[model samples]
Target: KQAILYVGHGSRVKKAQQEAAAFLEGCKAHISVPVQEISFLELQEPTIETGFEACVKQGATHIAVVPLLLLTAAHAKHDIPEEIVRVASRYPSVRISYGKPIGIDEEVVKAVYHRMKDIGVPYENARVVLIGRGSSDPDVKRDVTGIANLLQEMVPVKEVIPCFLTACGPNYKEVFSELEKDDGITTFIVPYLLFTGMLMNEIEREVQKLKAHNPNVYLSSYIGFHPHVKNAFLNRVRETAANSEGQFDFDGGS
Candidate 1:
């Protein structure tokens, strides 16, 4: 049997964990693989190794570890794969596969736009402040802005700049500094996150402080556990396993 392992970027917040679980649960029926399990990178229970063993217990010799990440950042490129490498050593007979994440896709852009539209925010000539969970990764730094640029094409925004929340540079303060020059442009802030908790609470506080600006800052909710995104994850699973280009080969070269 083939095992499809759903891996998540675990959060310290229980609510976020529940959100991840709910999404994973919704995905259970979307894949062809009969055996599947969910695990976390950190800050939660049932680590990757545990999930792998759970699949093995169900007689799955071939497994695919799919990350439930929005961006192809450090965790997808390094951390999760590294954990799988370590876990693969424990099971000499099992074969594992790695799946790519939902990086900069149109469906993702639609999901973001869907959130804005649902919240009744103006996507027209208004200044858009695309918020990300700032990472130190260079690719992440570049991709978030690239995503904002693409988002502008579909949403018809006057100007959209990517801003981070306390990890990388180009902080939201830059939004203020730039807004000073553009006078009456309203800024629409949308956080690029799958789940929300304390970080959003912090974001809300920052948005409240933006009342000093000329027009006003409108804050939209995170694209949290949306059905469209869940559909993408479902498709990603089947596509990744069907491709089968890299079967991990982490059996220590036999």
Candidate 2:
């Protein structure tokens, strides 16, 4: 049987690590094949090297490496791909396929809608501020903007603004400030992050502070363990497998 590795951006926070593991466990329950979960950095065990070694030992001839990240940022572009090359070389016969990130897919948009609906955010007359885990890559930022645009088609909003946590421009504070200036607009902040952690808590706290001044500001929870996410992961695997026939070269880092 083929092996699937769900790689996540390792966090320093224990809760963040648990959330990633929990999400992977949920995905494993739905998937038929043997699935393995690994983290890219510290704050968790089973680094990419260790996970790949285990997969090879378990006779995974063709492995699908799926990133549990939202966008094609540094992790997907540089880190993950680099690790794949290092591990795949040990098993010359093993063909490794790297899947696209979680955010770019349409399924993620549905998850965002669910989160927004859960918090009683109106489909109409409510402005959306999607706070994404920003990246240095312009394409990554564009991918996030594309998702925000797709979301706008589903709901009527005055504006769907894409902001970042750290890397890119228009941090949470700036986005909130901009929304405050607009008249009669109730802002709904939707986190494009994967798990609940310090970042999520910080965003909520900031939203609360914003609410003190402007009651229209509402904060939605981070994208938690949704079943649709499993479907998205499987879709990426299928797509990557379909394209594995020819020579594939991944120049990007994690």
Candidate 3:
């Protein structure tokens, strides 16, 4: 049978790695095919190459490479594509399909709403801060804005502010500062990240600091370990494989 490989952006933090593994395990529980998780860089074992090799050894000929990334940024545009090309070239007979990212999915949007609800944030009145794992890609930022706009339509919020964790405008502190300037603004920070790691922890710390400044603010957990996330990942795999060069046909050889 074919293999499904979920590749995440590797982090230096061990907790992040474990979280990714846990999420992948959650994905594994629902999918019937042989599934495995791999990291694209340091901070985790079983790099993409090793993971694919293992799948091949297990008699997988056609592989679906699903990136567990949020946006179609550097990892999706360059790194993952390059890796797929490199690996696919090594096995000409083996067909490899790369899937789309989870950033633009509707279920992902629902998950965001669920997280906001989980933290007791009012669906309509709360000032929502949608935080993303910042990227240099302008499209990534635009995608986040699109998601925020969609969220605004669903929730009765005065404004759905889009911020980034690292690379873009309106970092957590700045967002907090903006919220502090306004009166009766019930701020809610919703992390757009997929896994619980250093960024989540940092966001938590920022939320705590903000709470010290304004006790009315609320913070939700990172969008990890959610059941819908697995569906999103699987959908990415199916969509990618469907649009790829070859059909989903496994030949059972390494």
Best by lDDT: 1
The list of candidate 3 runs beyond 4 A from truth reads: 34-40, 243-254
Deviation in Å, model 2, residue 210 alpha carbon: 1.3
Off by over 4 Å in 2: 34-41, 242-254
Global lDDT scores for all candidate models: 0.79, 0.74, 0.74
- In terms of TM-score, which candidate is strongest? 1
Q: For residues 1-254, could you state the per-residue lDDT of candidate 1 as single tens digits?
A: 88898899998999999989888978887776889999999998689889988999999988888899877778988888888888877887877777767777777777778877776755678777888888888788787777787888887777777888867878876765666443667677788888888888888877776755545677888987777777777767776667555644333321
What is the Å distance of residue 97 in model 2 from its true position? 1.2
Clashes of 2: 8
**For each candidate, what TM-score against the reference?**
0.91, 0.89, 0.87
**TM-score ranking of the models:** 1, 2, 3
Residue 54's lDDT in candidate 2: 82
> Pairs clashing in candidate 1?
none
Order by lDDT, highest first: 1, 3, 2
Tell me each candidate's RMSD, in Å, in order: 2.5, 2.4, 3.9
Clash count for each candidate, listed in order shown: 0, 8, 1
